[PDB]
Write a protein that holds these residues in place. Structure first.
Motif, PDB file in Angstrom:
ATOM      1  N   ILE A  10       0.884  -1.157   0.000  1.00 39.13           N
ATOM      2  CA  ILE A  10       0.000   0.000   0.000  1.00 39.13           C
ATOM      3  C   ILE A  10       0.938   1.227   0.000  1.00 39.13           C
ATOM      4  CG2 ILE A  10      -1.898   1.164   1.117  1.00 39.13           C
ATOM      5  CD1 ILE A  10      -2.335  -1.810   0.331  1.00 39.13           C
ATOM      6  N   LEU A  11       0.886   2.013  -1.061  1.00 40.56           N
ATOM      7  CA  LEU A  11       1.740   3.179  -1.166  1.00 40.56           C
ATOM      8  C   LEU A  11       0.885   4.436  -1.077  1.00 40.56           C
ATOM      9  CD1 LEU A  11       4.596   3.731  -3.698  1.00 40.56           C
ATOM     10  CD2 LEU A  11       2.928   5.516  -3.090  1.00 40.56           C
ATOM     11  N   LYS A  12       1.251   5.331  -0.163  1.00 41.33           N
ATOM     12  CA  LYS A  12       0.520   6.590   0.057  1.00 41.33           C
ATOM     13  C   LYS A  12       1.474   7.769   0.227  1.00 41.33           C
ATOM     14  CE  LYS A  12      -4.040   5.884   0.428  1.00 41.33           C
ATOM     15  NZ  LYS A  12      -4.029   4.441   0.084  1.00 41.33           N
ATOM     16  N   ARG A  13       0.951   8.968  -0.004  1.00 43.43           N
ATOM     17  CA  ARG A  13       1.738  10.188   0.143  1.00 43.43           C
ATOM     18  C   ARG A  13       1.114  11.189   1.126  1.00 43.43           C
ATOM     19  NH1 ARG A  13       0.554  12.948  -5.687  1.00 43.43           N
ATOM     20  NH2 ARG A  13      -1.565  13.757  -5.327  1.00 43.43           N
ATOM     21  N   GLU A  14       1.955  12.096   1.621  1.00 44.97           N
ATOM     22  CA  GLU A  14       1.552  13.159   2.542  1.00 44.97           C
ATOM     23  C   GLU A  14       2.087  14.526   2.123  1.00 44.97           C
ATOM     24  OE1 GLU A  14       1.814  12.351   6.963  1.00 44.97           O
ATOM     25  OE2 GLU A  14      -0.264  12.612   6.297  1.00 44.97           O
ATOM     26  N   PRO A  15       1.257  15.569   2.235  1.00 47.78           N
ATOM     27  CA  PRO A  15      -0.126  15.523   2.707  1.00 47.78           C
ATOM     28  C   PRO A  15      -0.905  14.801   1.590  1.00 47.78           C
ATOM     29  CG  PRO A  15       0.261  17.588   1.665  1.00 47.78           C
ATOM     30  CD  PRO A  15       1.613  16.909   1.748  1.00 47.78           C
ATOM     31  N   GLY A  16      -2.146  14.402   1.847  1.00 54.87           N
ATOM     32  CA  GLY A  16      -2.922  13.715   0.818  1.00 54.87           C
ATOM     33  C   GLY A  16      -3.147  12.272   1.229  1.00 54.87           C
ATOM     34  N   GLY A  17      -3.384  11.386   0.266  1.00 48.77           N
ATOM     35  CA  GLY A  17      -3.593   9.990   0.613  1.00 48.77           C
ATOM     36  C   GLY A  17      -5.039   9.594   0.863  1.00 48.77           C
ATOM     37  N   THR A  18      -5.899  10.575   1.092  1.00 50.48           N
ATOM     38  CA  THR A  18      -7.315  10.294   1.274  1.00 50.48           C
ATOM     39  C   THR A  18      -8.047  11.345   0.473  1.00 50.48           C
ATOM     40  OG1 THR A  18      -7.606  11.720   3.211  1.00 50.48           O
ATOM     41  CG2 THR A  18      -6.920   9.441   3.596  1.00 50.48           C
ATOM     42  N   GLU A  19      -9.339  11.124   0.242  1.00 57.16           N
ATOM     43  CA  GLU A  19     -10.118  12.076  -0.528  1.00 57.16           C
ATOM     44  C   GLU A  19     -10.020  13.477   0.060  1.00 57.16           C
ATOM     45  OE1 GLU A  19     -14.446  11.254  -1.431  1.00 57.16           O
ATOM     46  OE2 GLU A  19     -14.563  13.391  -0.944  1.00 57.16           O
ATOM     47  N   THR A  20     -10.307  13.619   1.352  1.00 54.66           N
ATOM     48  CA  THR A  20     -10.247  14.950   1.948  1.00 54.66           C
ATOM     49  C   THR A  20      -8.808  15.418   2.165  1.00 54.66           C
ATOM     50  OG1 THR A  20     -12.344  14.513   3.100  1.00 54.66           O
ATOM     51  CG2 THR A  20     -11.093  16.460   3.761  1.00 54.66           C
ATOM     52  N   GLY A  21      -7.914  14.481   2.471  1.00 52.95           N
ATOM     53  CA  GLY A  21      -6.524  14.855   2.664  1.00 52.95           C
ATOM     54  C   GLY A  21      -6.000  15.488   1.385  1.00 52.95           C
ATOM     55  N   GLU A  22      -6.453  14.996   0.228  1.00 57.10           N
ATOM     56  CA  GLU A  22      -5.993  15.541  -1.051  1.00 57.10           C
ATOM     57  C   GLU A  22      -6.539  16.952  -1.238  1.00 57.10           C
ATOM     58  OE1 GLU A  22      -3.780  14.622  -3.438  1.00 57.10           O
ATOM     59  OE2 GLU A  22      -3.271  12.796  -2.374  1.00 57.10           O
ATOM     60  N   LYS A  23      -7.735  17.215  -0.705  1.00 54.67           N
ATOM     61  CA  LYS A  23      -8.305  18.559  -0.794  1.00 54.67           C
ATOM     62  C   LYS A  23      -7.429  19.432   0.104  1.00 54.67           C
ATOM     63  CE  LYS A  23     -13.227  17.609  -1.820  1.00 54.67           C
ATOM     64  NZ  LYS A  23     -13.218  16.113  -1.816  1.00 54.67           N
ATOM     65  N   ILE A  24      -7.027  18.880   1.246  1.00 56.39           N
ATOM     66  CA  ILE A  24      -6.148  19.636   2.136  1.00 56.39           C
ATOM     67  C   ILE A  24      -4.815  19.891   1.438  1.00 56.39           C
ATOM     68  CG2 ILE A  24      -4.750  19.567   4.247  1.00 56.39           C
ATOM     69  CD1 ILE A  24      -7.196  18.049   5.486  1.00 56.39           C
ATOM     70  N   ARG A  25      -4.241  18.860   0.813  1.00 57.55           N
ATOM     71  CA  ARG A  25      -2.967  19.027   0.099  1.00 57.55           C
ATOM     72  C   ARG A  25      -2.976  20.189  -0.907  1.00 57.55           C
ATOM     73  NH1 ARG A  25       1.596  15.794  -1.650  1.00 57.55           N
ATOM     74  NH2 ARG A  25       2.234  16.451  -3.768  1.00 57.55           N
ATOM     75  N   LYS A  26      -4.069  20.328  -1.654  1.00 61.94           N
ATOM     76  CA  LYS A  26      -4.165  21.391  -2.662  1.00 61.94           C
ATOM     77  C   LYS A  26      -4.125  22.789  -2.045  1.00 61.94           C
ATOM     78  CE  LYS A  26      -7.428  21.006  -5.810  1.00 61.94           C
ATOM     79  NZ  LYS A  26      -8.775  21.179  -6.416  1.00 61.94           N
ATOM     80  N   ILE A  27      -4.751  22.953  -0.886  1.00 53.12           N
ATOM     81  CA  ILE A  27      -4.730  24.243  -0.204  1.00 53.12           C
ATOM     82  C   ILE A  27      -3.316  24.544   0.299  1.00 53.12           C
ATOM     83  CG2 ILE A  27      -5.433  25.508   1.868  1.00 53.12           C
ATOM     84  CD1 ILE A  27      -8.155  24.017   1.666  1.00 53.12           C
ATOM     85  N   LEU A  28      -2.655  23.533   0.848  1.00 44.26           N
ATOM     86  CA  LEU A  28      -1.303  23.724   1.370  1.00 44.26           C
ATOM     87  C   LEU A  28      -0.315  24.116   0.275  1.00 44.26           C
ATOM     88  CD1 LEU A  28      -1.202  20.913   4.047  1.00 44.26           C
ATOM     89  CD2 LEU A  28      -0.647  23.338   4.419  1.00 44.26           C
ATOM     90  N   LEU A  29      -0.449  23.497  -0.890  1.00 39.09           N
ATOM     91  CA  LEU A  29       0.446  23.816  -1.988  1.00 39.09           C
ATOM     92  C   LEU A  29       0.010  25.073  -2.722  1.00 39.09           C
ATOM     93  CD1 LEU A  29       1.152  20.245  -3.326  1.00 39.09           C
ATOM     94  CD2 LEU A  29       2.800  21.849  -2.339  1.00 39.09           C
ATOM     95  N   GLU A  30      -1.285  25.191  -2.995  1.00 48.14           N
ATOM     96  CA  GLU A  30      -1.786  26.358  -3.720  1.00 48.14           C
ATOM     97  C   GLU A  30      -1.873  27.665  -2.931  1.00 48.14           C
ATOM     98  OE1 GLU A  30      -5.355  25.953  -6.011  1.00 48.14           O
ATOM     99  OE2 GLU A  30      -4.787  23.955  -6.719  1.00 48.14           O
ATOM    100  N   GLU A  31      -2.177  27.576  -1.642  1.00 42.74           N
ATOM    101  CA  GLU A  31      -2.327  28.775  -0.824  1.00 42.74           C
ATOM    102  C   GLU A  31      -1.206  29.034   0.177  1.00 42.74           C
ATOM    103  OE1 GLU A  31      -4.958  30.311  -2.061  1.00 42.74           O
ATOM    104  OE2 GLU A  31      -5.306  28.462  -3.204  1.00 42.74           O
ATOM    105  N   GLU A  32      -1.003  30.305   0.492  1.00 43.54           N
ATOM    106  CA  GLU A  32       0.004  30.707   1.461  1.00 43.54           C
ATOM    107  C   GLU A  32      -0.691  30.739   2.821  1.00 43.54           C
ATOM    108  OE1 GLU A  32       2.992  30.934   2.115  1.00 43.54           O
ATOM    109  OE2 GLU A  32       3.767  32.988   2.179  1.00 43.54           O
ATOM    110  N   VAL A  33      -0.073  30.162   3.845  1.00 43.34           N
ATOM    111  CA  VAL A  33      -0.690  30.183   5.159  1.00 43.34           C
ATOM    112  C   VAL A  33       0.330  30.377   6.259  1.00 43.34           C
ATOM    113  CG1 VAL A  33      -2.604  28.759   4.418  1.00 43.34           C
ATOM    114  CG2 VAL A  33      -0.541  27.698   5.318  1.00 43.34           C
ATOM    115  N   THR A  34      -0.135  30.840   7.413  1.00 35.48           N
ATOM    116  CA  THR A  34       0.764  31.055   8.533  1.00 35.48           C
ATOM    117  C   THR A  34       1.358  29.708   8.921  1.00 35.48           C
ATOM    118  OG1 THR A  34      -0.920  30.747  10.273  1.00 35.48           O
ATOM    119  CG2 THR A  34      -0.723  32.940   9.262  1.00 35.48           C
ATOM    120  N   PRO A  35       2.512  29.714   9.601  1.00 35.13           N
ATOM    121  CA  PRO A  35       3.154  28.460  10.009  1.00 35.13           C
ATOM    122  C   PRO A  35       2.312  27.539  10.894  1.00 35.13           C
ATOM    123  CG  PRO A  35       4.762  30.205   9.930  1.00 35.13           C
ATOM    124  CD  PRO A  35       3.402  30.865   9.847  1.00 35.13           C
ATOM    125  N   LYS A  36       1.525  28.104  11.796  1.00 39.85           N
ATOM    126  CA  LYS A  36       0.726  27.263  12.661  1.00 39.85           C
ATOM    127  C   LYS A  36      -0.459  26.639  11.920  1.00 39.85           C
ATOM    128  CE  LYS A  36       1.989  29.242  17.170  1.00 39.85           C
ATOM    129  NZ  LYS A  36       1.387  29.781  18.420  1.00 39.85           N
TER     130      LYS A  36
END
Ligand SMILES: Nc1ncnc2c1ncn2[C@@H]1O[C@H](COP(=O)(O)OP(=O)(O)O)[C@@H](O)[C@H]1O
Ligand SMILES: Nc1ncnc2c1ncn2[C@@H]1O[C@H](COP(=O)(O)OP(=O)(O)O)[C@@H](O)[C@H]1O
Ligand SMILES: Cc1cn([C@H]2C[C@H](O)[C@@H](COP(=O)(O)OP(=O)(O)O)O2)c(=O)[nH]c1=O
Ligand SMILES: Cc1cn([C@H]2C[C@H](O)[C@@H](COP(=O)(O)OP(=O)(O)O)O2)c(=O)[nH]c1=O
Ligand SMILES: [Mg+2]
Lengths: 189, 184
Positions: free
Chosen positions: A32-58
C-alpha cells in the motif's frame, strides 16, 4: 511492515518509494503506497490548499496534522491485515519543515504528531540526505534555500534522536545505488 | 474591543451580534464582523471542507484550529487599528463541540486553542442557551444527542470561567436578549 521515506524536495523520495513498492510486490507482498499531505479524498483537498495557498506556520502545521490524522485512520487497518504500508513523507516532515524550518519547535510539533497519529510510529524510516543546492538543481513555496538548509539540518538531528528507526541514505549516490541500500536494509524483516 | 458569541446552531448568534453592530455603527465605534469557521480566504475554503466532508474528530479539530489561527492573525491587526471586533463563535466553540461534543477532552482542546490563538482571550463572550429542538426548529454538527453534549460542554465551560461568559435565554424575544447584551 510500516516504512516511510523522508528528505528535502529533490532528495529522491518519490522515485525510491516506487522502486521499493515494485520490489516488494514482485516478491509477493501486499503493498500500500501513500503520500503526505494527501492519501485520502479529503486529505488531497487539504494538500491542494497547502500547496496552492500561502498560510501562517501554525495553520500550515494544523493542515498537515488534519491530513495526517485522516491518513492514519485508513492505513492502521492495512497494517493490521499483513499489508506493507509505504509512505512518501510522514511525521518527520512536520518536525523537519514546521518544527525546524518554520521554527515552531521540534518538541511542540512532535507532541502534536503524537496526538495526530495516536502513536502510529514507523518500523523503518529512510531519510535521504543531500545538500540543498544539489536537491534544488535536480528537483513550490517550500523550496527556498535557507529554509531547506534548516530543514535538512533538522532531519539530521532527528536521525540522531531515533537511530533505531531512521536509516540515513547518501543522496549523492545514483538512483539505483540507493535502491540497493534500500533493499539491503529492508532485508532484516 | 474583542467580542464573541456562542451557542448551538440556531441559538440566535448571527442575529444578536449584528444588532450589537448596527448599534455601535450608530455610536461611531468602528466594528468589524468575523465568524468561525471562515473569516479569511483560506478559512472559507476550510469551512467548506468541514461542512461538506466527513472527517475524524481530530482532523475536524485541526481544521478548525487552522482556520482559527489564520483568522486570529487577521484579528490581531484590527485590535491594533483600534477597531471593534465582533466574532460569531471562537475558542469555546471547539471546546464544546470537539472537546465535549466529540469527547476529545476539555483541557486538550483548550491547550491547542491557546497554541493556535497565541493566548488571545475575548473580553466579553455571550453564551446563548436554548433547548435542542427549539434551535433545530429555527448540517453534520446537528444531531440532538451530540448537541446535548455540546450544550453540556458550554454550560460546564460557563461554570469554569464566569468571568467573561454571560449566558442568555434564547427562548426569549430577540429584543429581550438584545437588551440584556447592550448593557455590557
Ligand atoms: N539519486 C539521484 N541522482 C540523480 N537524480 C535523482 C536522484 N534521485 C532522484 N533524482 C531526480 O530528481 C528529481 C526528483 O526526484 P523525486 O524522486 O521526485 O524527489 P523528491 O520526491 O524527494 O522531490 C527526478 O528527476 C529524480 O529522478
Ligand atoms: N431571541 C430570539 N427569539 C426568537 N427567535 C430568535 C431569537 N434570536 C434569534 N432568533 C431567530 O432564530 C433563527 C436563527 O438565528 P441566528 O441569529 O441565525 O442564530 P445562530 O446565528 O445561532 O444560527 C432566526 O430566525 C433568528 O431570527
Ligand atoms: C508531510 C509534510 C510535507 N511538507 C511539504 C514538503 C513539500 O515541499 C510539500 C509537498 O510534498 P511532496 O509533494 O512530498 O514535495 P517533494 O516531492 O518536493 O518532496 O509538503 C511540509 O512542509 N510538512 C509536512 O508535514
Ligand atoms: C468555530 C467552530 C464551529 N463549529 C461548528 C458549529 C456549526 O455546527 C458549524 C458552523 O458554524 P456556524 O456557521 O456558526 O453555524 P451556527 O449559526 O448554526 O452556529 O461549525 C465547530 O464544530 N467547532 C468550532 O470550533
Ligand atoms: Mg516527491
Amino acid at each position: 511492515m510500516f516504512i516511510t521515506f523522508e528528505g528535502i524536495d529533490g532528495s529522491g523520495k518519490s522515485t525510491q518509494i516506487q522502486l521499493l513498492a515494485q520490489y516488494l510486490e514482485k516478491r509477493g507482498k501486499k503493498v500500500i503506497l501513500k503520500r503526505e499531505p494527501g492519501g485520502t479524498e479529503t486529505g488531497e483537498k487539504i494538500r491542494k490548499i497547502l500547496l496552492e495557498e500561502e498560510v501562517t506556520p501554525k495553520a500550515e502545521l494544523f493542515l498537515f496534522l488534519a491530513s495526517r490524522n485522516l491518513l492514519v485512520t485508513e492505513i492502521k487497518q492495512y497494517l493490521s491485515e499483513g499489508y506493507a504500508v509505504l509512505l512518501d513523507r510522514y511525521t518527520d516532515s512536520s518536525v523537519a519543515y514546521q518544527g525546524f524550518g518554520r521554527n515552531l519547535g521540534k518538541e511542540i510539533v512532535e507532541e502534536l504528531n503524537d496526538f495526530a497519529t495516536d502513536g502510529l510510529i514507523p518500523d523503518l524510516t529512510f531519510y535521504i540526505d543531500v545538500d540543498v543546492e544539489t536537491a534544488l538543481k535536480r528537483k513550490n513555496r517550500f523550496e527556498k534555500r535557507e529554509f531547506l538548509e534548516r530543514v535538512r539540518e533538522g532531519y539530521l538531528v532527528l536521525a540522531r534522536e531515533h537511530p533505531e528507526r531512521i536509516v540515513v541514505l547518501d543522496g549523492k549516490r545514483s538512483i539505483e545505488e540507493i535502491h540497493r541500500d534500500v533493499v539491503r536494509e529492508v532485508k532484516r524483516r
